[PDB]
Protein backbone atom coordinates (compact mmCIF):
# COMPACT_ATOMS: atom_id res chain seq x y z
CA UNK A 1 0.00 0.00 0.00
CA UNK A 2 1.38 3.38 -0.89
CA UNK A 3 1.84 5.30 2.32
CA UNK A 4 1.64 8.95 3.19
CA UNK A 5 5.16 10.50 3.44
CA UNK A 6 4.55 13.64 1.32
CA UNK A 7 2.34 16.79 1.78
CA UNK A 8 0.22 19.08 -0.39
CA UNK A 9 -1.57 22.36 0.34
CA UNK A 10 -4.72 21.27 -1.50
CA UNK A 11 -4.64 18.05 0.49
CA UNK A 12 -4.05 19.97 3.74
CA UNK A 13 -7.43 21.68 3.41
CA UNK A 14 -9.04 18.24 3.37
CA UNK A 15 -7.55 17.11 6.70
CA UNK A 16 -8.69 20.44 8.17
CA UNK A 17 -12.20 19.52 7.09
CA UNK A 18 -11.95 16.06 8.64
CA UNK A 19 -10.88 17.70 11.89
CA UNK A 20 -13.79 20.07 11.54
CA UNK A 21 -16.00 16.95 11.55
CA UNK A 22 -15.39 16.20 15.20
CA UNK A 23 -15.19 19.82 16.26
CA UNK A 24 -11.42 20.22 16.36
CA UNK A 25 -9.37 23.29 15.37
CA UNK A 26 -7.55 23.25 12.07
CA UNK A 27 -3.97 22.05 11.94
CA UNK A 28 -1.54 24.27 10.04
CA UNK A 29 0.95 21.70 8.81
CA UNK A 30 1.03 17.92 8.79
CA UNK A 31 4.54 17.86 10.20
CA UNK A 32 4.33 14.92 12.54
CA UNK A 33 3.72 16.89 15.72
CA UNK A 34 1.88 14.54 18.08
CA UNK A 35 -1.65 15.33 16.95
CA UNK A 36 -3.19 11.94 17.10
CA UNK A 37 -6.37 13.21 15.61
CA UNK A 38 -4.68 14.68 12.59
CA UNK A 39 -2.73 11.53 12.04
CA UNK A 40 -5.86 9.45 12.18
CA UNK A 41 -7.55 11.81 9.79
CA UNK A 42 -4.77 11.41 7.29
CA UNK A 43 -5.16 7.70 7.67
CA UNK A 44 -8.90 7.70 7.03
CA UNK A 45 -8.58 10.03 4.05
CA UNK A 46 -6.07 7.71 2.39
CA UNK A 47 -7.91 4.63 3.38
CA UNK A 48 -11.09 5.97 1.77
CA UNK A 49 -9.25 7.51 -1.22
CA UNK A 50 -8.54 3.89 -2.18
CA UNK A 51 -12.25 3.03 -2.25
CA UNK A 52 -13.55 5.89 -4.34
CA UNK A 53 -11.00 5.16 -6.90
CA UNK A 54 -11.65 1.45 -6.58
CA UNK A 55 -15.28 1.73 -7.47
CA UNK A 56 -14.67 2.16 -11.14
CA UNK A 57 -15.46 5.54 -12.63
CA UNK A 58 -15.06 6.57 -16.22
CA UNK A 59 -11.95 8.78 -15.98
CA UNK A 60 -10.38 6.41 -13.49
CA UNK A 61 -10.57 3.31 -15.68
CA UNK A 62 -7.70 3.56 -18.10
CA UNK A 63 -8.80 1.48 -21.02
CA UNK A 64 -6.58 -0.64 -23.19
CA UNK A 65 -3.39 0.42 -21.53
CA UNK A 66 -0.51 -1.96 -22.02
CA UNK A 67 1.58 -3.29 -19.19
CA UNK A 68 5.01 -4.40 -20.30
CA UNK A 69 6.87 -7.38 -18.90
CA UNK A 70 10.46 -6.77 -17.84
CA UNK A 71 12.51 -8.40 -20.52
CA UNK A 72 14.88 -10.63 -18.54
CA UNK A 73 12.47 -11.52 -15.77
CA UNK A 74 9.61 -12.12 -18.09
CA UNK A 75 7.06 -11.08 -15.58
CA UNK A 76 5.05 -7.97 -14.90
CA UNK A 77 4.93 -6.31 -11.45
CA UNK A 78 1.35 -6.09 -10.22
CA UNK A 79 1.82 -3.32 -7.67
CA UNK A 80 -0.51 -2.09 -4.94
CA UNK A 81 -1.22 1.05 -6.93
CA UNK A 82 -3.30 -0.97 -9.43
CA UNK A 83 -6.70 -1.06 -7.85
CA UNK A 84 -8.41 -3.23 -10.49
CA UNK A 85 -6.56 -4.88 -13.36
CA UNK A 86 -9.50 -6.64 -15.06
CA UNK A 87 -9.23 -7.29 -18.83
CA UNK A 88 -10.68 -5.64 -21.81
CA UNK A 89 -13.49 -7.86 -23.07
CA UNK A 90 -14.85 -10.62 -20.85
CA UNK A 91 -13.78 -13.27 -18.37
CA UNK A 92 -10.77 -11.39 -17.19
CA UNK A 93 -7.90 -13.78 -16.92
CA UNK A 94 -5.30 -11.91 -14.90
CA UNK A 95 -4.90 -12.35 -11.20
CA UNK A 96 -2.20 -11.32 -8.70
CA UNK A 97 -0.17 -14.23 -7.55
CA UNK A 98 2.75 -13.14 -5.54
CA UNK A 99 3.22 -9.67 -6.83
CA UNK A 100 3.01 -10.51 -10.50
CA UNK A 101 0.24 -10.81 -13.02
CA UNK A 102 -0.65 -14.42 -13.54
CA UNK A 103 -2.89 -15.74 -16.22
CA UNK A 104 -5.45 -17.57 -14.18
CA UNK A 105 -6.37 -19.69 -17.15
CA UNK A 106 -2.98 -20.52 -18.70
CA UNK A 107 -1.17 -20.98 -15.42
CA UNK A 108 1.72 -18.74 -16.42
CA UNK A 109 3.32 -15.86 -14.65
CA UNK A 110 5.56 -15.30 -17.68
CA UNK A 111 4.54 -12.88 -20.40
CA UNK A 112 6.31 -11.68 -23.50
CA UNK A 113 5.17 -8.40 -25.08
CA UNK A 114 2.54 -7.24 -22.65
CA UNK A 115 -1.16 -7.17 -21.96
CA UNK A 116 -4.09 -4.94 -22.79
CA UNK A 117 -5.80 -4.57 -19.46
CA UNK A 118 -8.27 -2.05 -18.14
CA UNK A 119 -6.60 -0.70 -15.03
CA UNK A 120 -7.95 1.53 -12.36
CA UNK A 121 -4.86 3.05 -10.80
CA UNK A 122 -4.43 5.13 -7.69
CA UNK A 123 -4.36 8.82 -8.30
CA UNK A 124 -3.63 11.39 -5.65
CA UNK A 125 -6.45 13.10 -3.81
CA UNK A 126 -5.49 16.25 -5.57
CA UNK A 127 -5.73 14.56 -8.94
CA UNK A 128 -9.43 14.07 -8.51
CA UNK A 129 -12.56 15.94 -9.79
CA UNK A 130 -13.85 18.48 -7.31
CA UNK A 131 -17.07 16.53 -6.99
CA UNK A 132 -15.28 13.54 -5.63
CA UNK A 133 -12.79 15.58 -3.58
CA UNK A 134 -15.71 16.76 -1.50
CA UNK A 135 -17.09 13.26 -1.16
CA UNK A 136 -13.82 11.61 -0.18
CA UNK A 137 -13.68 14.13 2.67
CA UNK A 138 -17.30 13.88 3.75
CA UNK A 139 -17.14 10.11 3.66
CA UNK A 140 -13.97 10.26 5.74
CA UNK A 141 -15.84 12.82 7.85
CA UNK A 142 -18.18 9.98 8.80
CA UNK A 143 -15.80 7.16 9.71
CA UNK A 144 -13.51 9.53 11.58
CA UNK A 145 -16.65 10.70 13.42
CA UNK A 146 -17.47 7.07 14.14
CA UNK A 147 -14.15 5.76 15.28
CA UNK A 148 -12.92 8.43 17.67
CA UNK A 149 -15.74 10.82 18.52
CA UNK A 150 -18.75 8.54 18.48
CA UNK A 151 -21.56 11.04 18.99
CA UNK A 152 -24.71 9.86 17.19
CA UNK A 153 -26.39 13.18 16.46
CA UNK A 154 -23.44 14.70 14.61
CA UNK A 155 -23.16 11.50 12.61
CA UNK A 156 -26.81 11.23 11.58
CA UNK A 157 -26.61 14.66 10.02
CA UNK A 158 -23.36 13.72 8.31
CA UNK A 159 -24.74 10.53 6.75
CA UNK A 160 -27.42 12.64 5.11
CA UNK A 161 -24.55 14.73 3.69
CA UNK A 162 -22.46 11.85 2.44
CA UNK A 163 -25.38 10.71 0.37
CA UNK A 164 -25.93 14.12 -1.20
CA UNK A 165 -22.30 14.19 -2.03
CA UNK A 166 -22.61 10.82 -3.70
CA UNK A 167 -25.53 11.98 -5.73
CA UNK A 168 -23.59 14.97 -6.90
CA UNK A 169 -20.65 12.74 -7.76
CA UNK A 170 -22.75 10.33 -9.72
CA UNK A 171 -24.27 13.17 -11.61
CA UNK A 172 -20.77 14.20 -12.54
CA UNK A 173 -19.92 11.30 -14.81
CA UNK A 174 -23.34 10.64 -16.32
CA UNK A 175 -22.64 14.00 -17.88
CA UNK A 176 -18.88 13.35 -18.20
CA UNK A 177 -19.08 9.86 -19.68
CA UNK A 178 -21.91 10.84 -22.01
CA UNK A 179 -23.29 7.34 -22.26
CA UNK A 180 -25.64 6.62 -25.14
CA UNK A 181 -28.20 3.81 -25.16
CA UNK A 182 -28.95 3.36 -28.83
CA UNK A 183 -26.10 5.11 -30.63
CA UNK A 184 -22.98 4.46 -28.63
CA UNK A 185 -22.79 0.95 -27.24
CA UNK A 186 -21.55 -2.35 -28.64
CA UNK A 187 -24.78 -4.25 -29.31
CA UNK A 188 -27.62 -1.92 -30.23
CA UNK A 189 -25.38 0.46 -32.11
CA UNK A 190 -24.94 -2.27 -34.70
CA UNK A 191 -28.66 -2.96 -35.02
CA UNK A 192 -29.50 0.56 -36.19
CA UNK A 193 -27.61 0.29 -39.48
CA UNK A 194 -29.78 0.86 -42.55
Amino acid sequence: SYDMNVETAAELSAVNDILASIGEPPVSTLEGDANADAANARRILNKINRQIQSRGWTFNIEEGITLLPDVYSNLIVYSDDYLSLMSTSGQSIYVNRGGYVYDRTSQSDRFDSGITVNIIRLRDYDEMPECFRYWIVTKASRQFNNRFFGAPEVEGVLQEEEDEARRLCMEYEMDYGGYNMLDGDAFTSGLLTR
Binding site: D3, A34, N35, A36, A39, Y72
Partner: protein, 134 residues
Amino acid sequence: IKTVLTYQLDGSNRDFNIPFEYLARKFVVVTLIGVDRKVLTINTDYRFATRTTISLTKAWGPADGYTTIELRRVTSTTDRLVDFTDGSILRAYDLNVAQIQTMHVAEEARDLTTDTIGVNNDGHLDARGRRIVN
Protein backbone atom coordinates in the same frame (compact mmCIF):
# COMPACT_ATOMS: atom_id res chain seq x y z
CA ILE B 1 26.10 -18.06 8.69
CA LYS B 2 24.31 -19.08 6.76
CA THR B 3 21.10 -17.75 5.25
CA VAL B 4 20.87 -20.05 2.21
CA LEU B 5 21.31 -23.77 2.80
CA THR B 6 20.26 -26.75 0.68
CA TYR B 7 19.51 -30.26 1.85
CA GLN B 8 19.48 -33.58 0.03
CA LEU B 9 16.24 -35.24 -0.90
CA ASP B 10 15.56 -38.93 -0.53
CA GLY B 11 12.07 -40.24 -0.64
CA SER B 12 11.40 -40.80 3.04
CA ASN B 13 12.88 -37.82 4.84
CA ARG B 14 10.47 -35.07 5.42
CA ASP B 15 11.95 -33.07 8.27
CA PHE B 16 14.65 -30.55 7.50
CA ASN B 17 16.01 -28.02 10.00
CA ILE B 18 16.44 -24.28 9.52
CA PRO B 19 19.63 -22.70 10.86
CA PHE B 20 19.07 -18.99 10.27
CA GLU B 21 17.42 -16.58 12.63
CA TYR B 22 14.34 -15.91 10.58
CA LEU B 23 12.21 -12.94 11.53
CA ALA B 24 8.58 -13.58 10.62
CA ARG B 25 8.11 -16.90 8.86
CA LYS B 26 6.84 -15.81 5.55
CA PHE B 27 10.47 -15.03 5.18
CA VAL B 28 11.60 -18.65 4.78
CA VAL B 29 10.94 -20.00 1.30
CA VAL B 30 11.35 -23.71 0.57
CA THR B 31 11.88 -24.54 -3.10
CA LEU B 32 12.41 -28.11 -4.27
CA ILE B 33 15.14 -27.64 -6.86
CA GLY B 34 15.27 -31.09 -8.35
CA VAL B 35 15.34 -30.84 -12.10
CA ASP B 36 13.00 -27.82 -12.15
CA ARG B 37 12.55 -25.11 -9.55
CA LYS B 38 9.31 -25.66 -7.64
CA VAL B 39 8.20 -23.55 -4.69
CA LEU B 40 6.34 -25.07 -1.76
CA THR B 41 3.34 -23.33 -0.21
CA ILE B 42 2.99 -22.47 3.43
CA ASN B 43 0.61 -25.20 4.55
CA THR B 44 -0.54 -27.40 1.67
CA ASP B 45 2.81 -29.16 1.25
CA TYR B 46 5.34 -28.02 3.88
CA ARG B 47 4.57 -26.99 7.46
CA PHE B 48 6.67 -25.45 10.23
CA ALA B 49 6.71 -28.14 12.84
CA THR B 50 8.93 -26.38 15.32
CA ARG B 51 10.38 -22.96 14.94
CA THR B 52 13.42 -24.77 13.67
CA THR B 53 12.10 -27.50 11.30
CA ILE B 54 10.08 -27.48 8.09
CA SER B 55 8.28 -30.73 7.72
CA LEU B 56 7.04 -31.69 4.33
CA THR B 57 3.63 -33.40 4.21
CA LYS B 58 4.26 -35.43 1.05
CA ALA B 59 7.85 -36.49 1.83
CA TRP B 60 9.17 -35.76 -1.66
CA GLY B 61 12.04 -37.66 -3.19
CA PRO B 62 13.89 -38.30 -6.44
CA ALA B 63 11.12 -40.68 -7.51
CA ASP B 64 8.98 -37.58 -8.00
CA GLY B 65 11.83 -36.01 -9.97
CA TYR B 66 12.95 -33.57 -7.26
CA THR B 67 16.20 -33.57 -5.32
CA THR B 68 18.06 -31.02 -3.21
CA ILE B 69 15.46 -29.20 -1.10
CA GLU B 70 16.59 -25.58 -1.12
CA LEU B 71 15.24 -23.60 1.82
CA ARG B 72 16.55 -20.03 1.77
CA ARG B 73 15.45 -16.99 3.76
CA VAL B 74 14.43 -13.95 1.72
CA THR B 75 13.77 -10.88 3.83
CA SER B 76 11.19 -8.59 2.27
CA THR B 77 12.40 -5.12 1.35
CA THR B 78 8.91 -3.67 0.89
CA ASP B 79 6.90 -5.38 3.65
CA ARG B 80 8.61 -3.65 6.55
CA LEU B 81 7.94 -5.10 9.97
CA VAL B 82 8.08 -1.70 11.67
CA ASP B 83 6.38 1.44 10.47
CA PHE B 84 6.90 4.33 12.77
CA THR B 85 3.78 6.43 13.17
CA ASP B 86 3.32 9.84 14.64
CA GLY B 87 1.77 9.84 18.06
CA SER B 88 2.99 6.40 19.01
CA ILE B 89 5.42 5.70 21.84
CA LEU B 90 8.88 5.03 20.40
CA ARG B 91 9.30 1.64 21.87
CA ALA B 92 12.77 0.19 21.77
CA TYR B 93 11.47 -3.11 20.42
CA ASP B 94 10.49 -1.20 17.27
CA LEU B 95 13.88 0.38 16.59
CA ASN B 96 15.60 -2.94 17.23
CA VAL B 97 13.26 -4.82 14.90
CA ALA B 98 13.82 -2.23 12.17
CA GLN B 99 17.59 -2.53 12.52
CA ILE B 100 17.41 -6.33 12.67
CA GLN B 101 15.33 -6.54 9.51
CA THR B 102 17.57 -4.26 7.46
CA MET B 103 20.63 -6.12 8.70
CA HIS B 104 18.99 -9.40 7.70
CA VAL B 105 18.50 -8.04 4.20
CA ALA B 106 22.19 -7.14 4.08
CA GLU B 107 23.18 -10.52 5.53
CA GLU B 108 21.37 -12.27 2.70
CA ALA B 109 23.00 -9.79 0.32
CA ARG B 110 26.28 -11.28 1.50
CA ASP B 111 25.14 -14.71 0.09
CA LEU B 112 24.81 -13.83 -3.58
CA THR B 113 28.26 -15.31 -3.91
CA THR B 114 26.76 -18.74 -3.26
CA ASP B 115 24.38 -17.55 -5.93
CA THR B 116 26.65 -16.42 -8.90
CA ILE B 117 28.83 -18.00 -11.56
CA GLY B 118 31.51 -19.33 -9.27
CA VAL B 119 35.25 -19.71 -9.43
CA ASN B 120 36.75 -23.19 -9.80
CA ASN B 121 40.22 -24.34 -8.87
CA ASP B 122 42.47 -21.64 -10.31
CA GLY B 123 40.71 -18.54 -11.53
CA HIS B 124 38.52 -20.49 -13.86
CA LEU B 125 35.05 -19.14 -13.90
CA ASP B 126 32.66 -21.96 -13.78
CA ALA B 127 29.16 -22.65 -14.83
CA ARG B 128 28.08 -26.03 -13.59
CA GLY B 129 25.61 -26.90 -16.29
CA ARG B 130 23.71 -23.62 -16.25
CA ARG B 131 24.09 -22.52 -19.81
CA ILE B 132 24.76 -18.83 -19.92
CA VAL B 133 21.90 -17.00 -21.53
CA ASN B 134 21.48 -13.51 -22.92
